[PDB]
Amino acid sequence: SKLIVPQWPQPKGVAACSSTRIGGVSLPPYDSLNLGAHCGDNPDHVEENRKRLFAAGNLPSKPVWLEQVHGKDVLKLTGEPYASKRADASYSNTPGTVCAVMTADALPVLFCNRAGTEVAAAHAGWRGLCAGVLEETVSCFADNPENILAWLGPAIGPRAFEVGGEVREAFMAVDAKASAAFIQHGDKYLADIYQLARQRLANVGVEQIFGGDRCTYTENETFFSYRRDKTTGRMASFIWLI
Ligand SMILES: CC(=O)N[C@H]1[C@@H](OP(=O)(O)OP(=O)(O)OC[C@H]2O[C@@H](n3ccc(=O)[nH]c3=O)[C@H](O)[C@@H]2O)O[C@H](CO)[C@@H](O)[C@@H]1O[C@H](C)C(=O)O
């Protein structure tokens, strides 16, 4: 349909979905289910696309949209309204509360515990992934990392994610083993954002990791991609306790 449903061993109390570009009202280059409000689209179309996602996903409440800044801060969803939503991840243990991250190449990661009593969503672009957003998201859970599941959503894969030293140096400063995930490609590198996520998740003891098969740049019928399109829309990934 419009929506991707993560293929992971989802506990009964957990629901998740990840949007695609299909099924909205936005015009090119935002065509069509653009959920992002700061990328130059018509605000009335973004509002309608967000309502369509709400209906298609059977969400129990409106998603808690974050003021994403490519950092490592996590908002605990203790109840609307919020003083500040300046964060790149959210955490919930409240039934019906919808965690949401907005992406167009950055890695969305969805998290839940085996008990299906706590969920989280993280926006892991290269800058936030390097800074520790995933480790910070795991640290918000009451449960131990051995009992946490992670789903790697659609991101820019290593076929397409060309980077320079701004990026490789940053990662090698935090954890030298990141070098494996950078492959020389002329004067630049191809970076494997899924590998870097798997490193950071293993570092905090998250072992049960799913997804990581999609490519936002390559699969242009399905996804917006900042790197491919420059001016483009945003998908989002969603998780909640039923
Ligand atoms: C995957 C990811 O983190 N993408 C993010 C990143 O874009 P990116 O595309 O990486 O741009 P760069 O940071 O400016 O550059 C990162 C590195 O990549 C080199 N490069 C860039 C372009 C190119 O063609 N070739 C090339 O080698 C460049 O020299 C630098 O070393 O930075 C943008 C903000 O500037 C974000 O909006 C974007 O977030 C997305 C939307 C989201 O939230 O989903």
Numbering used by the authors: 2 to 243
Give sentences from the paper.
YfiH is a PG-editing factor whose absence causes misincorporation of l-Ser instead of l-Ala into peptide stems, but its mechanistic function is unknown. Our results show that YfiH forms an extended L-shaped binding groove for the UDP-MurNAc-monopeptide and is a cytoplasmic amidase specific for hydrolyzing UDP–MurNAc–l-Ser, a noncanonical reaction by-product from the MurC reaction.
Serendipitously, the electron density map contained a prominent blob of well-resolved density for an endogenous compound, presumably copurified with YfiH-C107A and trapped during crystallogenesis. The structure of UDP-MurNAc-bound E. coli YfiH adopts an overall globular structure that features a pair of two central β-sheets sandwiched by multiple α-helices, which is similar to the structures of Shigella flexneri YfiH and Geobacillus stearothermophilus YlmD (with root mean square difference [RMSD] values of 0.9 Å and 1.3 Å, respectively). UDP-MurNAc is bound to a preformed groove located on one side of the double β-sheets and at a distinct β-turn (aa 104 to 108). UDP-MurNAc forms a largely extended conformation in the elongated L-shaped binding groove of YfiH, where the uridine moiety forms a sharp angle with the diphosphate-linked MurNAc. The aromatic ring of uracil packs against the side chain of Arg228 from H7, forming the turning point of the groove. The lactyl oxygens of MurNAc interact with His71 from L3 and His124, which forms a catalytic triad with Asp89 and Cys107.
